[PDB]
């Protein structure tokens, strides 16, 4: 379980910065013993970092991949098979968080999800996205990719893991940060901000 996380740091620029930024944003917002929804939770890496900071948290992990959720169950809290496009779990949440998941939805799916997240959030609640974002112009996307490659080089990520990541990027529907911040505003979030960024990777949030 520590080996994967070590691999994730090799593959993701500023992994600690962007994940911690989300944890700290949540921690500054939510009441003690908060209820948290983790969308596209995977192995539960984001749910874990939040629990470490806020041990009394009630966390609900959602992911369409049973294989991923099994390992999450293994790391650990509720776990649920579900698609991001499906209705969110009921009951309301103090925070909704997501890491490297939402960029797989169509732009129409993202905007609809943003609205449904807003509706799931209790007053004062926060949505935080740790996200892969697109360069706004081709030269910027080339720079973003170059910077990603520089990280993978420096951290000596295994060749096959980088190749697999490259492959999975063919299923991406990334867009630039500014556009999706605007969509947050459009979805009825009171305040939106980018907390942290390292070229292609960014943590942003909206409050209801
Ligand atoms: C790159 S992994 C991120 C895992 C975890 N959130 C993290 O930050 O380490 C993307 C995850 O999103 C999930 N996912 C992608 N599209 C999804 C969808 N439409 N509905 C549900 N889960 C989805 C995948 O199953 C996978 O577990
Ligand atoms: Ca992806």
UniProtKB/TrEMBL annotation:
Binding, S-adenosyl-L-methionine: 19, 63, 83-84
Residue positions annotated to bind Ca(2+) are 103-104, 172
- Give the signal peptide as a residue range, or say none if absent: none
Entries under Gene3D superfamilies matching the protein: Vaccinia Virus protein VP39 (3.40.50.150)
Report the record's Gene Ontology biological process terms. Answer: antibiotic biosynthetic process; methylation
Q: What SUPFAM superfamilies does the entry give?
A: S-adenosyl-L-methionine-dependent methyltransferases (SSF53335)
CDD domains, per the entry = AdoMet_MTases
Keyword Magnesium tagged: no
* Limits of the Methyltransferase domain: 36-125
List the Pfam families hit by this protein, alphabetically: Methyltransf_25 (PF13649)
Q: Keywords assigned by UniProt?
A: Calcium, Metal-binding, Methyltransferase, S-adenosyl-L-methionine, Transferase
Q: Please give the Gene Ontology molecular function terms for this protein.
A: metal ion binding; methyltransferase activity
Record-given protein name: SAM dependent methyltransferase
Upper lineage ranks? Bacteria, Bacillati, Actinomycetota, Actinomycetes, Kitasatosporales
